[PDB]
Design a protein around this ligand. Structure first.
Ligand code: ZN
Length: 168
């Protein structure tokens, strides 16, 4: 199923996710719906809290053939180094992009879709994607890094877009 993605300024985007107790068929359903939703809106990453499911689950797929699926359940940042930034987007902040400071390299521990643990070292776009999605799980958005003026301007942009998109 395709789930509805929340937009700012929805307050449910600020909730802190609980860890997944047990990776069972209900969780695997959520993972599958999250991928379906992410591909349907043309995203490369999605956190559970974006679809109003407040558990520590993330899906990523940067591939163009939509077949290098990455699932992070209960991710844990083990180490990070360096600093970078690209203009990030987000399905919760429609059509807005902004450069945000990130670590360049990241090492995480997570569970996969089967509930088996794995470690992953990432750099480049992947490292940035993981950090952006892990932020979502503790109620952080990429706009939080920007000036108050930039933040307001982003909010207004989105509110205006949702105002027009709802036609009637
Ligand atoms: Zn996002």
């Amino acid at each position: 199923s395709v789930l509805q993605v929340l937009h700012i300024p929805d307050e449910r985007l600020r909730k802190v996710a609980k860890p997944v107790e047990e990776v069972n068929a209900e969780i695997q359903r959520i993972v599958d719906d999250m991928f379906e939703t992410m591909y349907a809106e043309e995203g490369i990453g999605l956190a559970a809290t974006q679809v109003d499911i407040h558990q520590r689950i993330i899906v990523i797929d940067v591939s163009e053939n939509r077949d290098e699926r990455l699932v992070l359940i209960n991710p844990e940042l083990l180490e990070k180094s360096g600093e970078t930034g690209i203009e990030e987007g987000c399905l919760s902040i429609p059509e807005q992009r902004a450069l945000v400071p990130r670590a360049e390299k990241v090492k995480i521990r997570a569970l996969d879709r089967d509930g088996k643990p794995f470690e992953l070292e990432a750099d480049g776009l992947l490292a940035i994607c993981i950090q952006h999605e892990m932020d979502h799980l503790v109620g952080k958005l990429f706009m939080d890094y920007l000036s108050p003026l930039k933040q307001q301007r982003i909010r207004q942009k989105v509110e205006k877009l949702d105002r027009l998109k709802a036609r009637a």
